[PDB]
Design a protein around this nucleic acid. Structure first.
Ligand SMILES: *OP(=O)(O)OC[C@H]1O[C@@H](n2cnc3c(N)ncnc32)[C@H](O)[C@@H]1O
Length: 635
DNA sequence: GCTGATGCGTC
DNA sequence: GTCGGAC
DNA sequence: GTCCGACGACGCATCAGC
């Protein structure tokens, strides 16, 4: 009898059946999800968020098992497994057109309001079909993403409008945020997985209705309960890190339970897995302090793109990105190369490599920017213009055996013994086994001279497995720009401000920076900036720059194609900014004509360091200096 | 038949 | 990709 | 240290507008 508007999955003593706002077998109302979202947004401790989400999931499992998968994807704001490549194709512009049409308002009015609040949901809401359902809403999202071709944008808009007109209470707020790609729950993959393992542990699936067991933790002590949930949570996590595909896991989970999940879902070539990531380290001394006694290896950190290469029993090859996207069609040249890299005894494998752009005439690595000019789907290897060289650094699976639980020392040994190097095509990452601080510093200096970002550091025997659920950032990355006094540092003028969104709402979220062109006495936009400040520094900058707002830009400020700032600023503040490198920009005018007739120069991964109170705009980094720095790069 | 805006992936 | 904040 | 969501440049692919 409970109207979903009153649904409260944050209550104490939540009963999956009696406290749900729908009847057994009935479709999960979307308003039940939105209310769950509200209660999750009301808190900042993940543990409380997880329990609240787990309560909804327990009711879904008890009452409407078929809706579990759509409710999960709604909670994650995803459309499906990443390797299927479903994409909404809906941005803010298209979303605001849908809001405008659905609210009888004008586009510019809706546009201004959304920019001020930094949230599209509030506008869409504050503006008879049957109640929306979770799977219903989820299905309409997938219909939107499957619309393709000419006039498809108008059809996507019709669907979005139909959703909004059926919205009630806070539904529209969350419809708009999901389509916007900014749900802002504070809860994502890891917390949703914890909520799921907690839900199916407390309220097991597959019981005869009404379920006899609704809270399997009641009979345990608080301590035993916590230990039990951590263990069950790890079972799900380690399975997910090997098979990050809910389409595969949920049917098994509902049919055989969590404790038997690894028997049915396990690492297999052809199914992407979560890759090992790296923790940034600010110097060699921090590396030694972090690994203390453990022996470790250093490897070049190549500046390319991650390629997880799967060879299946039978010969089929698949290649996946860091985010489990399917890149098989992008690398036909690599697929034809597989026979050359493996010994004939190798019948299957999963390799961890970096794909790097490679100049075959000069036999040299090329920058990342050249690698990105490859087409996303190339059918003919003969049409490839940017060759790649594979730098292999790990082996995760070999000849039917998962190596996830073996230490790096053995995974690397098997890689070196079972695979074959070919210059410019497939080689092992340059490496050095040492604990001598001078040798490491010399090795770091060489990696940069050899066209790399720095070093990867990895333990060989102690905590050296490939178990992402135990530690996802088990590796250390020591980049040149992490070091103090090293890396490109510039003093740039603040010429504009952009209204913040989400956590930055009611504030400036980013800024437009410029270098000083001496020859024309103009300030030339060079990049935007939006990270590196504390919340306090960012608030101070909102107040100090608010005074400098102008209705129109100064005549000596050139931005060309850059995003026009929401608020123009009188060139006064000069900020010190660090970046990983300089790039040739297709939009930014800074230093155009000094290194390239058509293109200016921008900053790769800029971040705020500190205000330079001792510098006026005329003494900022000059466009000539920017060009000089960029030339030092490509020597 | 072409061009520019832009979604969304890479880092 | 870099970064800061709450836990 | 984990987890999450603020924010960056830049490219191909796609599609609206012409
Ligand atoms: O900065 P980040 O955390 O994305 O760095 C990790 C990425 O670095 C790339 N990479 C390049 N070379 C290596 C080696 N030798 N070992 C491990 N990772 C490496 C990868 O693309 C990785 O995701």
């Amino acid at each position: 009898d409970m109207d979903p508007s009153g649904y409260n999955p944050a209550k104490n003593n939540y009963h999956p059946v009696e406290d749900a706002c729908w009847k057994p077998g009935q479709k999960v109302p979307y308003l039940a999800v939105a209310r769950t979202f509200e209660k999750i947004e009301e808190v900042s401790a993940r543990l409380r968020m997880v329990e609240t989400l787990s309560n909804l999931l327990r009711s879904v499992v008890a009452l409407s098992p078929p809706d579990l998968l759509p409710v999960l994807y709604l909670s994650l704001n995803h459309l499906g497994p990443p390797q299927q490549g479903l994409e909404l194709g809906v941005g803010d512009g298209v979303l605001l057109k849908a809001v405008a049409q659905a609210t009888g308002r004008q586009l510019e009015s809706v546009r201004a309001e959304a920019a001020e609040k930094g949230d599209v949901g509030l506008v869409a809401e504050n503006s008879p079909p049957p109640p929306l359902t979770a799977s219903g809403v989820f299905s309409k999202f997938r219909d939107i993403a499957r619309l393709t071709g000419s006039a498809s944008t108008a059809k996507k808009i019709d669907i979005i409008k139909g959703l909004f007109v059926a919205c009630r209470h806070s539904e529209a707020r969350f419809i708009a945020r999901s389509l916007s790609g900014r749900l802002r729950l504070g809860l994502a993959e890891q917390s949703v997985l914890a909520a799921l393992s907690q839900a199916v542990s407390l309220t097991p699936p597959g019981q005869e209705f009404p379920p006899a067991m609704v809270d399997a933790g009641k009979g345990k002590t608080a301590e035993a309960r916590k230990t039990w949930l951590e263990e069950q949570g790890m079972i799900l996590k380690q399975t997910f890190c090997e098979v990050p595909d809910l389409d595969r896991i949920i049917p098994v989970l509902l049919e055989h339970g969590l404790e038997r999940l690894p028997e049915h879902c396990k690492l297999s070539p052809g199914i992407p897995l979560k890759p090992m990531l790296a923790h940034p380290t600010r110097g060699i001394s921090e590396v030694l302090k972090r690994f203390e006694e453990a022996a470790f290896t250093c490897e070049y950190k190549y500046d390319g793109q991650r390629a997880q290469i799967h060879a299946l029993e039978g010969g089929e090859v698949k290649i996946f990105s860091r985010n489990q996207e399917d890149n098989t069609g992008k690398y036909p040249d690599i697929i034809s190369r597989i026979p050359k890299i493996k010994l004939p005894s190798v019948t299957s494998f999963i390799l961890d490599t970096e794909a790097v752009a490679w100049d075959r005439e000069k036999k040299q690595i090329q920058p990342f920017q050249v690698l990105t000019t490859r087409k996303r789907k190339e059918v003919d290897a003969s049409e490839i213009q940017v060759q790649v060289c594979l730098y292999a650094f790990d082996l995760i699976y070999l000849n039917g055996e998962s190596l996830v639980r073996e230490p790096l020392s053995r995974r690397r040994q098997l890689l070196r013994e079972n695979f074959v190097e070919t210059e410019g095509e497939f080689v092992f990452a340059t490496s050095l086994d040492t604990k001598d601080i001078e040798q490491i510093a010399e090795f770091l200096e060489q990696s940069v001279k050899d066209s790399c970002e720095g070093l990867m550091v990895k333990t060989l025997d102690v905590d050296a497995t490939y178990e992402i659920a135990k530690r996802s950032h088990n590796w250390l990355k020591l980049k040149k720009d992490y070091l103090d006094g090293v890396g490109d540092t510039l003093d740039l003028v603040v010429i504009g401000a952009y209204l913040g969104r989400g956590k930055r709402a009611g504030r400036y979220g980013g800024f437009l920076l410029a270098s000083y062109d001496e020859d024309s006495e103009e300030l030339q936009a060079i990049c935007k900036l939006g990270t590196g400040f504390s919340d306090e520094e960012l608030e101070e900058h909102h107040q100090s720059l608010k005074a400098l707002v102008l209705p129109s830009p100064r005549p000596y400020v050139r931005i060309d194609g850059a995003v026009i700032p929401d608020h123009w600023l009188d060139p006064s503040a000069v900020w010190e900014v660090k970046c990983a490198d300089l790039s040739l920009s297709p939009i930014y005018p800074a230093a155009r004509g000094l290194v390239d007739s058509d293109k200016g120069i921008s900053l790769r991964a800029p971040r705020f360091i500190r205000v330079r109170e001792d510098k006026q705009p005329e003494q900022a980094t000059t466009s000539a200096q920017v060009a000089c720095l960029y030339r030092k790069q490509s020597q």
